[PDB]
Amino acid sequence: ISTEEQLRRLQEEKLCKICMDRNIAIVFVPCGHLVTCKQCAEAVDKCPMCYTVITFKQKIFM
């Protein structure tokens, strides 16, 4: 696999799993999944990946 396709794959992994436009920017407490950008996190009350009820949406920074 090429450098370019590796890079594209890693860039797509960072994308919000709901809008696929912005990068992920929120961690859900308590399940710990990184799924959404800040805006798309407003729409979810359960984690889309594990359906755990979200008790806090922590903004993240790399």
Could you list the residues that contact Zn ion (CB under 5 A)? 16, 18-19, 31, 33, 37, 40, 47, 49-50, 52
How far apart are the C-alpha atoms of 57 and 20, rounded to whole Å?
19
By rule CB under 8 A, what count of residues binds its own copies?
21
Task: Pick out residues in 15-54 that bind Ca ion (CB under 5 A).
Answer: 21
CA atoms within 13 A on the CB side of 23: 8
Residue 39, Cβ neighbours under 10 Å: how many? 14
Locate tokens 């890079």: which residue? Answer: 7
Q: 49 phi and psi, to 5 degrees? A: -85, -35
15 contact, one of its own copies, Zn ion, Ca ion, none, CB 5-8 Å limit per kind: none
Q: What does the binding site for Ca ion look like in residue numbers (CB under 5 A)?
A: 21
Q: Which residues bind its own copies (CB under 8 A)?
A: 3-4, 6-7, 10-11, 13-14, 27, 29-34, 56, 58-62
